Amino acid sequence: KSEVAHRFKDLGEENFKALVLIAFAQYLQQCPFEDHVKLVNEVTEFAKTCVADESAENCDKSLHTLFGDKLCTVETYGEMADCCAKQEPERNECFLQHKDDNPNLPRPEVDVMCTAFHDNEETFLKKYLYEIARRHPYFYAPELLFFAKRYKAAFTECCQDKAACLLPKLDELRDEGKASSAKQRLKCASLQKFGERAFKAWAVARLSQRFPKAEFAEVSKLVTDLTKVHTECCHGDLLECADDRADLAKYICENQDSISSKLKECCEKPLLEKSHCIAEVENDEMPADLPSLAADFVESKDVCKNYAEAKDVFLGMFLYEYARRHPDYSVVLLLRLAKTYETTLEKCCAAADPHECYAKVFDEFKPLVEEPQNLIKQNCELFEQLGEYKFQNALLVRYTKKVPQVSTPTLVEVSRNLGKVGSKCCKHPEAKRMPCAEDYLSVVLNQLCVLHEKTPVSDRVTKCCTESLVNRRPCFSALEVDETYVPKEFNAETFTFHADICTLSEKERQIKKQTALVELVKHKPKATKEQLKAVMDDFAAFVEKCCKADDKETCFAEEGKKL
Ligand SMILES: N[C@@H](Cc1cc(I)c(Oc2cc(I)c(O)c(I)c2)c(I)c1)C(=O)O
Ligand SMILES: N[C@@H](Cc1cc(I)c(Oc2cc(I)c(O)c(I)c2)c(I)c1)C(=O)O
Ligand SMILES: N[C@@H](Cc1cc(I)c(Oc2cc(I)c(O)c(I)c2)c(I)c1)C(=O)O
Numbered sequence: 001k002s003e004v005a006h007r008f009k010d011l012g013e014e015n016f017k018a019l020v021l022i023a024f025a026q027y028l029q030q031c032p033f034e035d036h037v038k039l040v041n042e043v044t045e046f047a048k049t050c051v052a053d054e055s056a057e058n059c060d061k062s063l064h065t066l067f068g069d070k071l072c073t074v075e076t077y078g079e080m081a082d083c084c085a086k087q088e089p090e091r092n093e094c095f096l097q098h099k100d101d102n103p104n105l106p107r108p109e110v111d112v113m114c115t116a117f118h119d120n121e122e123t124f125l126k127k128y129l130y131e132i133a134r135r136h137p138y139f140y141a142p143e144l145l146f147f148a149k150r151y152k153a154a155f156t157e158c159c160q161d162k163a164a165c166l167l168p169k170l171d172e173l174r175d176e177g178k179a180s181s182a183k184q185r186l187k188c189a190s191l192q193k194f195g196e197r198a199f200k201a202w203a204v205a206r207l208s209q210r211f212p213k214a215e216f217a218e219v220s221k222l223v224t225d226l227t228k229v230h231t232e233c234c235h236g237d238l239l240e241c242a243d244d245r246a247d248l249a250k251y252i253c254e255n256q257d258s259i260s261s262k263l264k265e266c267c268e269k270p271l272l273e274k275s276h277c278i279a280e281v282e283n284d285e286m287p288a289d290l291p292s293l294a295a296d297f298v299e300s301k302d303v304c305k306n307y308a309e310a311k312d313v314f315l316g317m318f319l320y321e322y323a324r325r326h327p328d329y330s331v332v333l334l335l336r337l338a339k340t341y342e343t344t345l346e347k348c349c350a351a352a353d354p355h356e357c358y359a360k361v362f363d364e365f366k367p368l369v370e371e372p373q374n375l376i377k378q379n380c381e382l383f384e385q386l387g388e389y390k391f392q393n394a395l396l397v398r399y400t401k402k403v404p405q406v407s408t409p410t411l412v413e414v415s416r417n418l419g420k421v422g423s424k425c426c427k428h429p430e431a432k433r434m435p436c437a438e439d440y441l442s443v444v445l446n447q448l449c450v451l452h453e454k455t456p457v458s459d460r461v462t463k464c465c466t467e468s469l470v471n472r473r474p475c476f477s478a479l480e481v482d483e484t485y486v487p488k489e490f491n492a493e494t495f496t497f498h499a500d501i502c503t504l505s506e507k508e509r510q511i512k513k514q515t516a517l518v519e520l521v522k523h524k525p526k527a528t529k530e531q532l533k534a535v536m537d538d539f540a541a542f543v544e545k546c547c548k549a550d551d552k553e554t555c556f557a558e559e560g561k562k563l
Helices: 003-011 013-027 031-050 061-071 090-097 108-117 121-135 139-157 162-193 196-210 216-233 239-256 271-279 293-299 302-308 310-324 331-348 360-387 386-403 408-425 430-453 459-467 471-479 506-523 529-546 551-560
Strands: none
Touching: 003 013, 003 031, 003 061, 013 031, 013 061, 013 121, 013 139, 013 239, 031 061, 031 121, 061 090, 108 121, 108 139, 108 162, 108 459, 121 139, 139 162, 139 239, 139 271, 162 196, 162 430, 196 216, 196 310, 196 331, 216 239, 216 310, 216 408, 239 271, 293 310, 293 360, 302 310, 302 331, 310 331, 310 386, 331 360, 331 430, 360 386, 360 408, 360 430, 360 471, 386 408, 386 506, 408 506, 430 459, 430 471, 459 471, 506 529, 529 551
């Protein structure tokens, strides 16, 4: 009778409170912390009245109506959507469209924080959720609850040398948080830009690889439930998403003998740890003597009849059977082969002799398999030779010359993340490299697509990002150097002195040099590799000398006007 009471009872007060704070901070990313805490405490107090009596006034209203009415209580330059003037369901759609993937937003001393922690523990932990959620408005909300548990545990151990304990733990946590956020942003862009059918096919392929002994009916059931979870989370329905994720983990753990031999330990863990464990479980062993793919999908007399009589079941069986046999292929490579198979049946089954028309369809798959295999072989060699920083700089000059209109901060950020694929995947044997590397590159290229959509400047980025979700990686790799680009004239404001540049950490030092290298390539787009190195080495020596001089500002200004 009351949906706010239903979710309060299922989730418990503590997780309900946290999920409503996450929801409000993802919808209004520029609103101060104290204003959101007010609204949350009021929603919670109301929810308790509906638990006491599901029939009290207002207790039958939808969650969208209740939350939106709260948000609407607290310079446009001529352009601003007015979400609070709308009725539901258009009002919720308006809030979703204001989410900002690159918001204009800004860690005290170790002893300071521990002082705040034992002072006001609850307030301390709510500030953590608020700052993550407002910077990452598509973070998977149930996973953010797991990060919060671990963030509390680090303080309730280390505050008891504190900086030698706490700071490495907090570093591993923002590292894994950044990678979690980018992985979920790909699921939401998949569902919203390319549709439910495209997300379902991605899930059929990934779960058939990971659960190869499961029957097709069992994989299809898991795919329907997983699709409902992510549709809710990406549409702002966070209390519903968390409750359905919990139910899916309970189903899997009661049905292990029909799904996978790898789930035992995952399924004995506490509640948030269990779902996190299942999502990252290793692939099960493939059954030994599976019948050939060619017999069911190429040689059978019934191919055209099965495609006409039950199109979605027949093509979903093709994808399940191919994926469970090929854990060594990326997901995007399997989705490419299924699209090629369907296109070939549409043409052949409408003509005279189909059996001979599609008899060689597996020959068309070989160029598609070989192109990614060769790419990853070569970058792992280059990585082994150069190391991560110089591998990054190689990828940065390459991508700047493909799309030089893109902004310098976006080129540095994407290029640094493309180069992390070396440390992440090149240690695996040949066979495990392709899923690791090509599915990671899909996540990083989606980052480039959504950071560029806000302010489009490169027609070639817009085309590669809109044409085909599965073909994005081969589309970017195929771009040649841009010959139409006009060299950027020299500015100088990039290089104004700031005191921090003489006391940089190693990571900060690399980011500055990679920024200078992108600007140099934009200014001199046809200088050679050796010419770029000589200029870069000379400017870095200039910074070195002026950071030692008796008057730093004067040296930078005096020697800078000479350069
Ligand atoms: N000296 C090498 C040439 C080479 C340079 C780069 I830089 C590279 O790295 C990438 C990564 C991605 I992702 C791409 O889309 C592209 I195009 C190149 C690779 I692999 C090879 C050789 O001859 O083998
Ligand atoms: N204007 C910025 C500070 C800033 C100064 C310089 I001078 C600079 O250029 C280099 C070039 C090389 I090559 C280096 O190794 C280094 I370290 C800095 C850059 I990028 C940034 C601010 O106000 O924050
Ligand atoms: N003297 C020229 C202007 C000019 C100034 C600099 I200082 C320079 O050197 C760099 C080094 C890096 I590293 C960059 O990212 C960039 I942009 C320019 C170059 I080549 C040209 C004129 O009067 O027209």
